[PDB]
Amino acid sequence: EVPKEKEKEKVSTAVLSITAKAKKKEKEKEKKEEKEKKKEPEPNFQLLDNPARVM
Amino acid sequence: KKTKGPDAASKLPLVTPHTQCRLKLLKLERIKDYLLMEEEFIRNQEQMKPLEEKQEEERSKVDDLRGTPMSVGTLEEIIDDHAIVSTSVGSEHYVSILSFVDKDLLEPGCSVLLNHKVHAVIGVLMDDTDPLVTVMKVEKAPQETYADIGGLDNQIQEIKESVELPLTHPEYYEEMGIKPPKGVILYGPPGTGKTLLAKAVANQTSATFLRVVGSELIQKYLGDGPKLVRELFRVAEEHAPSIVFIDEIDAIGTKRYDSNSGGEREIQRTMLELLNQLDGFDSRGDVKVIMATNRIETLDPALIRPGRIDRKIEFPLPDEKTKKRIFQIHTSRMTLADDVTLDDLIMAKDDLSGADIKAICTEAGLMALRERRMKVTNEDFKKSKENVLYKKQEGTPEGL
Amino acid sequence: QELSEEDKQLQDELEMLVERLGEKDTSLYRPALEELRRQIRSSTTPLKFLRPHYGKLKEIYENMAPGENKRFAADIISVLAMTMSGERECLKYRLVGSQEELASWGHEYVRHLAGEVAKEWQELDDAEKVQREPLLTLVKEIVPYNMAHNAEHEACDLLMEIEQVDMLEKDIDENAYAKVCLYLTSCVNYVPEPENSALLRCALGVFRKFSRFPEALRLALMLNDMELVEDIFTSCKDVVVQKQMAFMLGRHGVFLELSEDVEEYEDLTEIMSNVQLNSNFLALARELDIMEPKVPDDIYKTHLSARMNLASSFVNGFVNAAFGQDKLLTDDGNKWLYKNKDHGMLSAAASLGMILLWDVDGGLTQIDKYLYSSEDYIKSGALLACGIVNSGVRNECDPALALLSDYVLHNSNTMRLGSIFGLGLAYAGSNREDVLTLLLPVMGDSKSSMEVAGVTALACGMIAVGSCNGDVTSTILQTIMEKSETELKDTYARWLPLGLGLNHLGKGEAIEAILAALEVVSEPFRSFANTLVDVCAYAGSGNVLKVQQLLHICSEHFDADMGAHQGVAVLGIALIAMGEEIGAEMALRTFGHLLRYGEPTLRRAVPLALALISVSNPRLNILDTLSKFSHDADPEVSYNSIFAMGMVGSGTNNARLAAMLRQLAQYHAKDPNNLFMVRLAQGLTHLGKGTLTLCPYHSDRQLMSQVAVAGLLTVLVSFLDVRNIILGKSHYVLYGLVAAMQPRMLVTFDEELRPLPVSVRVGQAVDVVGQAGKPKTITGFQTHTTPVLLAHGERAELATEEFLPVTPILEGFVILRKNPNYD
Numbered sequence A: 001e002v003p004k005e006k007e008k009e010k011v012s013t014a015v016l017s018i019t020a021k022a023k024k025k026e027k028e029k030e031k032k033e034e035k036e037k038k039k040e041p042e043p044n045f046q047l048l049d050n051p052a053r054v055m
Numbered sequence B: 001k002k003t004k005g006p007d008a009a010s011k012l013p014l015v016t017p018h019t020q021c022r023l024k025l026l027k028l029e030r031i032k033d034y035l036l037m038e039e040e041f042i043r044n045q046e047q048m049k050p051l052e053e054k055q056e057e058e059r060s061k062v063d064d065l066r067g068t069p070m071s072v073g074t075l076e077e078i079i080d081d082h083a084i085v086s087t088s089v090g091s092e093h094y095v096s097i098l099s100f101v102d103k104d105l106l107e108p109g110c111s112v113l114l115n116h117k118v119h120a121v122i123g124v125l126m127d128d129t130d131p132l133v134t135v136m137k138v139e140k141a142p143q144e145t146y147a148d149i150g151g152l153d154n155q156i157q158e159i160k161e162s163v164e165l166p167l168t169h170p171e172y173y174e175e176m177g178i179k180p181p182k183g184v185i186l187y188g189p190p191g192t193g194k195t196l197l198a199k200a201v202a203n204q205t206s207a208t209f210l211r212v213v214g215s216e217l218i219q220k221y222l223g224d225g226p227k228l229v230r231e232l233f234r235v236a237e238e239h240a241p242s243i244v245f246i247d248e249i250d251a252i253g254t255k256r257y258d259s260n261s262g263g264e265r266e267i268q269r270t271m272l273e274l275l276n277q278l279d280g281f282d283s284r285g286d287v288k289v290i291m292a293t294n295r296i297e298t299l300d301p302a303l304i305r306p307g308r309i310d311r312k313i314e315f316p317l318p319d320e321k322t323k324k325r326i327f328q329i330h331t332s333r334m335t336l337a338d339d340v341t342l343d344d345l346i347m348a349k350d351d352l353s354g355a356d357i358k359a360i361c362t363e364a365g366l367m368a369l370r371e372r373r374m375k376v377t378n379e380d381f382k383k384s385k386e387n388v389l390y391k392k393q394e395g396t397p398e399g400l
Numbered sequence C: 001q002e003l004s005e006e007d008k009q010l011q012d013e014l015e016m017l018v019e020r021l022g023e024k025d026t027s028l029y030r031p032a033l034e035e036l037r038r039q040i041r042s043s044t045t046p047l048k049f050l051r052p053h054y055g056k057l058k059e060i061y062e063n064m065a066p067g068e069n070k071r072f073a074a075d076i077i078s079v080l081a082m083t084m085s086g087e088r089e090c091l092k093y094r095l096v097g098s099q100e101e102l103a104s105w106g107h108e109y110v111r112h113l114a115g116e117v118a119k120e121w122q123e124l125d126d127a128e129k130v131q132r133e134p135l136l137t138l139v140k141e142i143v144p145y146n147m148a149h150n151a152e153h154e155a156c157d158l159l160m161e162i163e164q165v166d167m168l169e170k171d172i173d174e175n176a177y178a179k180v181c182l183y184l185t186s187c188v189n190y191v192p193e194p195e196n197s198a199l200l201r202c203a204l205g206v207f208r209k210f211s212r213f214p215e216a217l218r219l220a221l222m223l224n225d226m227e228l229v230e231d232i233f234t235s236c237k238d239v240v241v242q243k244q245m246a247f248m249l250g251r252h253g254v255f256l257e258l259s260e261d262v263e264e265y266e267d268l269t270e271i272m273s274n275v276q277l278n279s280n281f282l283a284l285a286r287e288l289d290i291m292e293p294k295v296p297d298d299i300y301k302t303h304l305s306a307r308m309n310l311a312s313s314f315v316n317g318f319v320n321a322a323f324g325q326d327k328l329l330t331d332d333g334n335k336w337l338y339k340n341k342d343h344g345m346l347s348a349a350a351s352l353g354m355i356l357l358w359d360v361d362g363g364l365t366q367i368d369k370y371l372y373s374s375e376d377y378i379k380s381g382a383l384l385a386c387g388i389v390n391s392g393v394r395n396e397c398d399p400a401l402a403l404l405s406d407y408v409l410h411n412s413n414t415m416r417l418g419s420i421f422g423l424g425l426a427y428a429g430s431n432r433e434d435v436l437t438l439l440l441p442v443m444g445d446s447k448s449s450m451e452v453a454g455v456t457a458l459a460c461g462m463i464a465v466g467s468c469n470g471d472v473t474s475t476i477l478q479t480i481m482e483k484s485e486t487e488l489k490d491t492y493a494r495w496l497p498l499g500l501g502l503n504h505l506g507k508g509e510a511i512e513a514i515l516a517a518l519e520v521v522s523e524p525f526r527s528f529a530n531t532l533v534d535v536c537a538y539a540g541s542g543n544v545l546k547v548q549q550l551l552h553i554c555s556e557h558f559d560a561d562m563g564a565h566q567g568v569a570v571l572g573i574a575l576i577a578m579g580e581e582i583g584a585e586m587a588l589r590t591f592g593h594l595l596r597y598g599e600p601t602l603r604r605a606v607p608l609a610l611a612l613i614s615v616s617n618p619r620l621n622i623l624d625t626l627s628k629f630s631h632d633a634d635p636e637v638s639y640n641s642i643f644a645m646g647m648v649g650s651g652t653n654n655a656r657l658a659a660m661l662r663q664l665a666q667y668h669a670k671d672p673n674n675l676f677m678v679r680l681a682q683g684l685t686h687l688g689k690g691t692l693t694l695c696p697y698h699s700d701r702q703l704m705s706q707v708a709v710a711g712l713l714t715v716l717v718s719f720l721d722v723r724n725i726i727l728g729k730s731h732y733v734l735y736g737l738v739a740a741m742q743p744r745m746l747v748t749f750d751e752e753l754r755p756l757p758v759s760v761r762v763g764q765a766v767d768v769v770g771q772a773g774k775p776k777t778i779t780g781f782q783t784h785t786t787p788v789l790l791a792h793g794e795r796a797e798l799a800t801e802e803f804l805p806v807t808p809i810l811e812g813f814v815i816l817r818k819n820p821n822y823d
């Protein structure tokens, strides 16, 4: 009922040598500048009205 | 069948140091970064598309009508609406193309597709990649420049003037109403001649270049040695106006052979076809024919005449400074030594030509690499002289 | 394999020695290593034999007792690590080693040591400054060795890697400083901005030290630091250096405002003002016999209409520009403009001013009669002609400011447009406070139209180019805000970002504040304006990051049609790294792929960047590609290709290109829209009779003149969308070539400032030997008298060692003095 879909078409930049050397300088600057409800309680302890499709 | 080739290579030969240094390093980083950015540009343009419009109108109308099965055959003739195509095993079809028609790229004698069933041309293969009957433009517009050869300043100026009378200042003698394709008759010692090529690369910096060396004493009954070169210079006029370098055939193929009749038919055909093409009254075009030789004596009287073949140029032996310059050029790539032993190898030398200079430079590196491997081998100071002797100059029993 | 007999014997001997050194007792450890090291440091002034003993030698070095034995052991491990290096074990052992004289261990060792020192100097973190001093001391020991053994260029490499160009200055002597500085200048083109300014500053330091002020001014102009230019001009004192500085400022076009306390100040300000520029240019043109007014008709080759006649008048003005000798618009000019129709009288008069540019005295008198003309277009054209005349050349009394008094803010749109454009061309690079304080209030006028406001912004930008004029920027932003966005983003607000880019030209970094202030603008114009100002500010830098951003943004669909800023991105691609040959010819190849698979807007803008790469440089591949794409289906693409060919051939008189344009004229004779601009391209090719080139790269084709590139970029911004604007009204924007129009011949004076007939050798100057920072080598000596047209690829050189120039850079103006050895 829910697709959880994403259309990105995004490819990472391949900066390698001197762009990465500037990236190292960018690292130099960038350095400073659900368990209790899932273990036991499966929904099997419900009550149903008298019309109820049950095998 | 051939017009031009895609020149998207030879990425900036001007690497200024040509030796491993920071500057050359940094130039290569800029080169590689641009390659990265160009690839990223085109990939992002092709991927982040401007618009999604159906099947790009290709599979809807043309692709299906072209069909799955196809066969290739040459296209023979053209008529106003249909086209006359000589397909495989000597089949001939008269069909009008309308799907994927590119008339300019279709052309007679080119490979086109046939959709089978209802045999109609549906496309053309502009690549084809089989124009191999006579191939002389494969080496066109050689990358060699003026700077590759030095110490020949007088000859460089003379040949440059003789070939920059066209291109540069063509109205000069257009007003003088002559349009002379005189060409240049080059002398020179047999120890040179591929410089007759090096001095030709100065003009090869502009337009293309054709070469006919050794050819034959055109025993062929059709002759058509110079006549096919006439067709190829016509092709050169279709292209950028090229020059024809016929070194060693202006000598042998056009010899002042002094017998008259019963003389291999080149004297009848080749010389007579050479002067017809060298006369501007018969063939037009900015084509300049460079007739270079090492035997000035065998100049045929038709070739002797400056009236049709003007601009006689003599190539002399290099002087002391010219020897210094050529040795500097050839040893620049190899870093001969840190002592720069330059003048000792040429001061007493005489009758040493460009081919000998290149040979001794190569052999100096070979002898150093043999066992004396020392980067800038300290032995190079005298080993350059050791391999400049190298015997091999001339040898003929004694007779003395 | 059977090795040499003596080689095997020595190998076995060294095997016995290393076994002795690897024995248990250490009483024989010292003698064994004494014996060993002597032949270890033998071949460097051997290493093959100890190839498999890496682990054993490491164990011996570690086991050696601290002291002499250990530090020789570290010495041997270091000198052998150059072969057995899985890491910089040579430097770690050598830091542990003796640190005594290292240079005797062979050239190969010291150079491997130098490289490893550079690696560690880059590798060590900021907090580690203990071992940095020992590496610096080792560097200061190896630099003299490199200087002696002609290794100064790699010495410069390691010193710039360690950022020690400051002590490079102190160590280098003049006997080899010229090639080191040339090496530095070559690295300048590709180093990013922080170290780029660092190498520029150190290059100024070397030349100031060695009294090399003429080339130091060239480097200061590269640094675009007017304060440092003034400082170094004060530093130099000799009359010869003073007067060559004034030529260099005058040739660059930027007027230096100084005091009369300096000696010969009147001549210095005159030659900086280019007063004698026109007189010398006409004198050389007469000496070449190239003075005859070339008719546009026989340029057209008419051997086989109002707009076409206008184009003929424009190309006639282009050909006769800077000459002032043309009777076609002088005697019967009034008849020609009267015969002319609609909007073209303004451009015809401006074309007459183009003929009279740099001719202050003659131009003003011959335009005074047309100033009182009846038609508003003729009056506005006359005023624009006056601004063109005073453009570039500086004047003591500055007649343009007084002449444009009522017209500067005149209510009539056309009259105000002509005066404003004229003042912009005049005060281009003057940075005059009075002119700025008089034109910016005109910028603030609300009665003026949108295009009038754009022209005011263009004038302000070209006046305050590369000045970071804060009040100009604030007025620009305030005017943009006050103008409503809907009417802003139509077709003409594209001049305001151009003014911003000019005002912050060549600065960078600070552009973040401008774009942040501009962020309030809506996307369709903001995405165009911020990109334009960014690329103009970062022009001549080679920022691969900025250009790939431009490549990413132009890669978008952008299909109200905001995709126009893809065009300015295309122009920025060429603009960022048009500096050297690399970065322009692969940018060319990038443009080829843009045309190869690109949007209609992208292919509309590509020829503009193609022209920007190689204006006035007729590269064969460019001419062929532009000619093949001149017949594209898109009319605007054809228009841009036509103009691109005109620009790349501009000021060249290239005969084969002119023939190609004539063939294009025959091809496009049916359609006048392409026909009249093909004529325009031919007039550009023959502009100034080819005497004045249009490439904004001067001083040996490596200096960006801000005013010329400003005017050129204004033309290309107009040619982004001439399919609307040149067809409609912008017959005046083409007159921005005055800034980019500079003569390309040599004018030789002497110490008494008289024209010398000294002959020089001129020809192709391209690198032959790259072994070091050798000066560019010239070939093809076609020597003749000093007036010689200097084109791309080819340079000039003095025929003999008899006349010493003030600067080795041989272009524009130069003073030649008698050599002491002249005989």
Ligand SMILES: Nc1ncnc2c1ncn2[C@@H]1O[C@H](COP(=O)(O)OP(=O)(O)O)[C@@H](O)[C@H]1O
Residues within 6 Å of the ligand: B148, B149, B150, B151, B152, B190, B191, B192, B193, B194, B195, B196, B197, B198, B318, B325, B326, B329, B353, B354, B355, B356, B358
């Ligand atoms: N003066 C020179 N300067 C630089 N290179 C040269 C010079 N002379 C010859 N060469 C190079 O050496 C090669 C052989 O030259 P050349 O003597 O013309 O050959 P050959 O003697 O075989 O005809 C040429 O290809 C040319 O590139």
